[PDB]
Structures are given as structure tokens and as C-alpha cells.
Ligand binder design. Structure first.
Ligand SMILES: [Mg+2]
Ligand SMILES: [Mg+2]
Ligand code: NA
Ligand code: NA
Ligand code: NA
Ligand code: NA
Ligand code: NA
Ligand code: NA
Ligand code: NA
Ligand code: NA
Lengths: 144, 144, 144, 144, 144, 144, 144
RNA sequence: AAAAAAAAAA
RNA sequence: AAAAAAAAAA
RNA sequence: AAAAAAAAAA
RNA sequence: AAAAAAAAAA
RNA sequence: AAAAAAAAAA
RNA sequence: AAAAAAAAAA
RNA sequence: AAAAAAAAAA
RNA sequence: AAAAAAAAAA
RNA sequence: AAAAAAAAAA
RNA sequence: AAAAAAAAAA
RNA sequence: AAAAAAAAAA
RNA sequence: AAAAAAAAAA
RNA sequence: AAAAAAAAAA
RNA sequence: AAAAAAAAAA
């Protein structure tokens, strides 16, 4: 290969876009209480911490969740996810449980193409339930 | 295809990175004076305007340039690029000229793999010369 | 095949969901007046009568309609459907007529993938018009 | 694919059924005492919690069980299942044990086709024994 | 081929629809100011001028834009499009520029299937920016 | 497929037409008297009710007719069509009869290419005769 | 194909015939009384109503008949045909009956080649019997 | 797709 | 499955 | 026979 | 990849 | 190995 | 998929 | 030689 | 014979 | 893809 | 059509 | 040449 | 390369 | 079926 | 032998 700078025979000025879309897997944590659903805000996906503070909308594709702290004494970890949508919330409670008390529980869900519209900060993605006090989410999404 | 949310059988917690790299084509303009080289600052590539203000380093791959305003009376536009590097500046002056007085001049250069290291805001990419008072750059680069 | 109970060598606790989705064809009737459109409520789809009272959202895929009582004297039955959507109602009036005075008129429409989002009880599916005083609907849908 | 509503050329009124059957995997927990068999009631399978309160009968295909709390000090978990049938109970004691003290024990059994009749709320499915104070069941069944 | 009228052996009365959908490419112009975004109203698509005044909804598929008057002295034309959506506006600024001062700038964007829902008159399609005082749009859409 | 907006690399301004042609099947009814031919006006094809009020001309391709009310006591329905043309009316009487007293009679005719010129509101399409007091027409045509 | 008038290189004067033969299916009705045979006159085939008044002879090929009004109360329609010939009448009584009280009875017969000679107005085709007061005939014939 | 009648054609 | 009209596309 | 949803399986 | 249940389809 | 997004290329 | 034990079978 | 039940196995 | 740099070419 | 100039190489 | 980056997948 | 919408058709 | 119009031709 | 003139076209 | 119109037909 070349070891020196070389000319490019540029043509006409191209189509450009200073502010493109970005497909991402975004990791963050939420706090969860015993017996109580936590509504996960879409606003958590927009942050300098993820290089996403310039976006104000996102299309979520899938949500995965893991318990992030240990469960109560004698118990195995569990985590549940209930999808939420502006056009009508679901009542599914997708659940994983650990089979070793020292191991994370995990579960996820995929949003079908027909429900992949945009969401903004004030929207919620899902409800999380767990016997652990924190849950770690990884959300696959398209910032736009 | 599915019209409903469906379960994902998530496993162990994955490797994650909240602050990934990003390959980009960044468009911006510089002002140019008659007979004078303008040193293009790398700092212009880091901006909320490009969603890149969270980066402090970038690896430039190629630089393309177009004249952005009309040339002086009786003249055809030209633009020249001289690559700059922290380990030693080049003396190449890659040049394009217009063949229609109403048309942009354009030129570019490719940086070879052996010279693709990082640059930071206080570094310069290249010198630009032109008979036009503004030049439009599109820089292909890897933010990291 | 086996005539006795046999062991299953179960492994780890599986992903579970006590409240799954359900794809359905739901039959119900609506009352219709001469010259007047009836807005069919989505709420009619959630009922112990269909085993669906535990759902609060549904994604409608298609709607079929039949006249359910006889037409006025000297007339053949007709039925019309006009699709309604939260993002903008249609002005199509899909229509079937009977060709025997003793026979039901029927028609349907399919909702395209891009318009398959959720609806809730307060939403409406379509407008129905007919010269018959009842219309029988079968709605293909995905409870979630 | 289509982006708009389209006509369906419906024919005669179809065979319909507002209250269909449903094949399911139903997850629930039972309490278990040291040295004592717990009889698992079929009635637990009919609940708003599983969207199954409209059913009166169910045909069980298989039963799987996991210990759901930790075992006594110094011990590995175990779980046993004894199938019960209205025409004559079994005396099999299908058993799984854990091989790591921190891990669930599990086991299951399949009901052969010749014994897949209906059961109702009054009936029992099986006896459960364990050294753990709760057992998690997942029962594969056909509600009808 | 036949030079005379011939009989058609018609059967039963067909499904009919007096008010069908229509796929279209709609051309219209908007006024644009220096430094200021113009929100393009969906209402502009419904007009006797396009034979579309009987519709009240439309599904937009793509948007293309051209500058429609000359640019300021010394400049090349440019046009930018920012997609807008009821579920969350984008922050993309898709841009084209002219490479001859006497030529139109152009650019477009495609709306993905998952974002193709209906819009009505009070909704907006996109924001337009330009250095030219008028922009000509051609919008590909499905009236329904 | 893409889940986000994407750029279109538009070129020059295309040929456009804000008022295109439209191929249609137009359903409407006419009143018919015993023993008397009804001249069907072309003007009935231009209406807001069909989204066609912006047109001044139409090219008719074929005409189909069904009786639309019941026949007199003891009789089977019949319908006849006689094609009319500005260059010379036909004397054909294409006829269908019902073979069940409760069923519609139907018939149609095709216009050959050599006779497919435009017609305007003032013109007539055909004469209709029937023993029923209304006839339902579906006219296949090209609005231009 | 050609869009203009073109010369034909005509030769000698051809054989001509101002008054050709014509193969036809002629529809007409006859009145019928209970228990009485109606002799169908060949003369009915020659009429301005069929464009056949310039003919004085016809060769009949086949005869089909349908009841044309409803039958008496409690009855199904029937129609019978007895072929008549100048060289000797038949005694066949070809018969059709309806299987739905609302439907026409129908039947026909074919005349063999050896019996296809001419008939004139004063000749009869066949005898018709029915329980209905009118019978519709369609006669396939060669006017000459 | 084959036949008959009127027409047109290589 | 072929054709026409409106659109989109390599 | 192919697709979707719930389940079951190599 | 095969089977069962609900649906949809050539 | 196939798909999507940003870039680059024959 | 092959073997052993109990059963059933062409 | 094929199936079922208990076991054993690549 | 293949690669890189400057040039030239279908 | 082929040739020339500088270089590098099996 | 091939490569790189972010994601998703058998 | 392939897809979508309206129509027409074997 | 195929079609139409005028001409010419085996 | 080939050529020329006017036109239309992939 | 192919097409059009009326008819008849598998
Ligand atoms: Mg009937
Ligand atoms: Mg371990
Ligand atoms: Na940022
Ligand atoms: Na930023
Ligand atoms: Na219920
Ligand atoms: Na209930
Ligand atoms: Na319920
Ligand atoms: Na109009
Ligand atoms: Na209109
Ligand atoms: Na006459």
C-alpha cells in the first residue's frame, strides 16, 4: 500500500449531512423496589455519557435486562419486562430467573417493525420488576 | 414478519461501551484570503453541530475541498491543499481548477495508513489556498 | 408411542411469560341505522366473551363485515367500511352488495404493516354503513 | 409491500368461535414442607394472572419443576414429582438434585397421549417433594 | 382487434369503492427566508390543484427539494431538509449544494416503512432551509 | 430494511404533472321506468363523490350493469344496454336476465379501441332498459 | 400500425352478394296455457326486431327453452319441447324441471344434419308445454 | 382449441 | 401471469 | 404449501 | 427442521 | 455469512 | 444409533 | 426387523 | 512477475 | 489493464 | 460488489 | 426488469 | 434494431 | 425481405 | 394459415 499522501480527483460537491443517525446499544441502570414496577424513561437514552445529547428522538428496536445487584436471602434473582407504547401499553411480562443464586437473571424483548416509531424524553420504554434493587438495561436503538 | 413484541432469551451480561467510535464525513467551511495559506484547525471537527463535541481525538483519513464562493472577475476558481502532519509537514500542493467560471474548483488527498494517527483540537489538518474567499471542506475521519 | 409417564431431563429455569400475546379472529355484531355511519369501538374486542378481558391493547390486521339482518323491501343488502386511524382517518368506502335478496352482503379491508400499531378501548376501528339494521364483523387481530 | 388499506373480497360468513382453545406454558410456585408431599391443584392453572379465568378445563401435557428457594445448610437441593391421575395415581417419584449447592434442582415428566384427558379445578396434577420451601412449576397444557 | 362493441358476460355485482387511494408525486413551492427554517404543512398536499381535495389524510413516502430561485450574489445555492414526525422530530439536516452558480441545489430523504403513518392538514412534513427565497418540493405519497 | 430516514441523492428537477390521468371503476345507480330507455349521462362520472370533479373529460372502456331493485311480481329481472356514440349510436341491445327471481340480472359491453375517444358531461354513454326501477352501473374508464 | 389512409391495389371486380346468409341466436317469448301445447311459429323468427325481416326462410339448428314467469303455488317450474317437422312430427317430450322454486326450468334439443332443411313463416318449430304462463326461447339458426 | 356463416389477409 | 394509468427503482 | 402468534422438539 | 393450538393465505 | 445505520470504493 | 432386561409384533 | 417400558452407551 | 510513487493510455 | 521513469522484491 | 466503524443475527 | 396503488384479464 | 408514411426491389 | 427519403424509438 | 364479427363447442 501507499506510504505517502496521494491526490483524490474530487468532482462536484456531494450531498452532506452534519447530523446523521446512529444505531446503538446503550447500557444504563435503573433502581427497582420490591413489588413495584419502575417505568423506564426514554430520556435516559439522551446523554453526553452516551454521546447522544444532540438527539431528541430515538427508535427503540429491542430491550434486554439483567439484575445488577444480589437478590434477597434464600432467593434466586428474577427480572420482568412489560413493554409500553404510546398507542397502547402491552400486558406481557417477559421474565427471566437465575438458576444459581450468585448469577444474574436476564430477559429481553424485540419490538416488531410495525411498532418501531420514534419516542422522545417524556415517553417510557417499559416497566421493570425485580427482587433485586438495581437492573442493568442494554437498549438497541436508532438515534435520529 | 411478527406484528407483536416477542421474547428474547438473553444470556450473560455482554461487553458494553457507552462511548463508541464513529466514522464520519464532516462538512464545514473556512475563510481564505488572496495569496495566503489558511491552516485548517482539527478543532473544527469537534462540535455539537456535528454531534462530535464528546470526542477529543480524531483520525483523519481523507480531505476534499471545493471553492464555496465565486472567483474574481475574469478568473476560473482554483483550490490547493497542502497536507500537514505533526511528524513533518508535506510540501505537496494538490490543486484543482474550474473549467467553467460558474463552477466550483475541487481537489482532495488521501492520508496513507502509516500516517493515520490521532489529532487533537490544537493540531492542523492542512493548508488551503484559493482565489475564492471561502472553501468548503468534507473530511472523512474516525472519531475516537 | 409411550403408554406411561416418562421422565423429562429438565435443565435450567426457562424464560417465562404468564401473560402472552394472542392472534385471534373475533366475531361480534353492531347495530346500524339507515343513512348513518356507525363508529365501531375497539373496546368491543376486549371481553370475557372472547377470553380477552385481560388485554387493554390490540393490533388490528384486517376487518371483514357481513350484513346480519335482511334488507328493506325490494332491496339487495349492502355494507360499507371506512377505515379509521388515530394518525388520520381514511375516506375509502369499501363496499359489497348482495346479488340475491336473501343473501348477505360482505366486504373487508386489510391494514398495511406500516399502519399496524396498537389501539385501546376508546379508539375506533372503522365506520360501518348498511341498509340492514345489524352488521356482523370478524376482526383479525393481535392481542398484546 | 402495500402502504395503504386495500380491499378484501370477502365471501360467505365463515365458521367462527369466540372462545377458542389455547396451548400454554404456565409458570407458578407452590409452598413445600420438609418431609411432606404437596398436592398441586389444577385450579391454580385458571387465573386472570394467566389470562385463563374463562376456562373450566385443561389437558396437561407435561410438568417441569425447579426448586425456588435455597436448600438447608450443608445440603444440595432436590425436587421430586409424583404424577396423579383421576383413573389411578402413579407411584413414580421422578427426582432431580443439584450438583452445586447454589443451583436449582429440576425434573419433569411427560403425560402419554392415552392419559391426556381433561382436568378441572377440583383435581390435582402431581405431588411435589423438596428440601426447599418453594418449588417453581412450568406446566405445558392445552386450555379448552 | 375488434372494431365493434362486444358483449361482456357479467356475473355477480363486484366489490366496489367510489373513493379509492392514490399514489402520487405532488409538486409545489414554498417561500424560504435567510437563516430561518420553514415548516412545510401537510395541508399543502390537499388541493383541487392536485385533484386531492377529497382526501383528508396522506402517507408520505419520500420528499425531494430543489432551489427554485437564484442564490445571493457570489454564492452557490443550497437546500436542507429536516424530517419532522408526530412521534418525534429528527435532527438530520440532509443537504445539497449546487456546483454551478446557475444551477439548482437539490436533496431528498426517504421515510422508512416503520415511520409511514398518516398525516393530516395540521401536521408538518419537514423543515426547509435555503439561501434561495423559494424551494420546489416533489413529495411522493399515498393519499387515502 | 431501514428503520431510519435516509438521504436521497436527487438530481435535476424532474418532469412533473400536478393533474394526472386516472384509470377507474366508477359505481353509480340510475332510475329506470317500465318500457322506457334511460339515457345515462357522462356527467354522472364527474363528482366529488368519486374524487373526479376536477376532470372535464373521460374515455370509457367498458360498461357493466346490474338490476338494483326487485322485479315485478311473477317475473325474472332483465337489463339491456344500447351503446351510444357521438359519431353514431349503436342499435345493439345487449341483455342479461336472472334465472332466479331473487337474483340480479347483469350484462356489459366493451368499447373497441377505435371508438375510445373522450366524452364530456353533456354526452351520454348508453341507454338502459329494465323491468326493475333501478339499475347499478360500474363503468371502467380513464379520466383525463 | 398505420395512422393514415393507404392505397389498396385492387384488381378485377370480385364476386359479390348484397343479401347474404346469417347465423344467429334469436331470443323471443311465447305464451303458454296450463295443460295445453303451444305450437311455436317459424314466422316469429322473421322480424325487424331481429334485423331478419328481409329473409323468408331459415334453417333451424337447435332450440333451447326456459320458463319466463314463476310457477303455480307449491310447484317447481317445468318446460317440455316436442320437435315438429314438415316430413313427420316427433313424439319426444324433452323436459327440464327446476330444483329451486325460484329458478327457471330449462331444456333444449338439437336437430340432426339430415333434418336441417328450410322452414318458412307458416311452418312450426316445436310444441312447448309448461306450468308457467310464458316460455323464453333461444333458437340457433341460419337465415338464408 | 376446433368447426360453420359474413368479412379481411399472406 | 400478461397489459394500461399514477409512483418508485436497478 | 408458505408466513405470524402460544407451546413442544432433534 | 418437524408436529400441535389460534390466524392468515395460494 | 446475511441484514440495518455512518463512511469509503470499482 | 448400537447392546442388555420385561412386553408386544410381521 | 420395527415400536413401547427400565438400563447402558457413542 | 507482483507492489508503491511520478507520468501516460484504452 | 498495458508501457515509461525512481524504488522495492521472489 | 468488496472493505472499515456502531448494531443485530444463524 | 422488479415492487406498490387504481383498473382490466386468462 | 424494430414500427409508420412516400419510393424502389427480389 | 433488402435499400433510400420524412418520422418515431430501445 | 392467421385476425375480426355472429354462432356453436370441449
Ligand atoms: Mg339460491
Ligand atoms: Mg458456578
Ligand atoms: Na454529545
Ligand atoms: Na453532541
Ligand atoms: Na376471561
Ligand atoms: Na376475567
Ligand atoms: Na382474563
Ligand atoms: Na378535485
Ligand atoms: Na374531489
Ligand atoms: Na332489417
Amino acid at each position: 500500500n501507499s506510504n505517502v499522501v496521494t491526490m483524490i480527483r474530487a468532482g462536484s460537491y456531494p450531498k452532506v449531512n452534519p447530523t446523521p443517525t446512529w444505531v446503538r446499544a446503550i447500557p444504563f441502570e435503573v433502581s427497582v423496589q420490591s413489588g413495584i414496577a419502575f417505568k423506564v424513561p426514554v430520556g435516559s437514552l439522551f446523554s453526553a455519557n452516551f454521546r447522544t445529547d444532540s438527539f431528541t428522538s430515538v427508535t427503540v428496536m429491542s430491550v434486554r435486562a439483567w439484575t445488577q445487584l444480589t437478590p434477597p436471602v434464600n432467593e434466586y434473582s428474577f427480572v420482568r419486562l412489560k413493554p409500553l407504547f404510546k398507542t397502547g401499553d402491552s400486558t406481557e411480562e417477559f421474565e427471566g430467573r437465575a438458576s444459581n443464586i450468585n448469577t444474574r437473571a436476564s430477559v429481553g424483548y424485540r419490538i416488531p417493525t410495525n411498532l418501531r416509531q420514534n419516542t422522545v424524553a417524556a415517553d417510557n420504554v417499559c416497566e421493570v420488576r425485580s427482587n433485586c434493587r438495581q437492573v442493568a438495561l442494554v437498549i438497541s436503538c436508532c438515534f435520529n
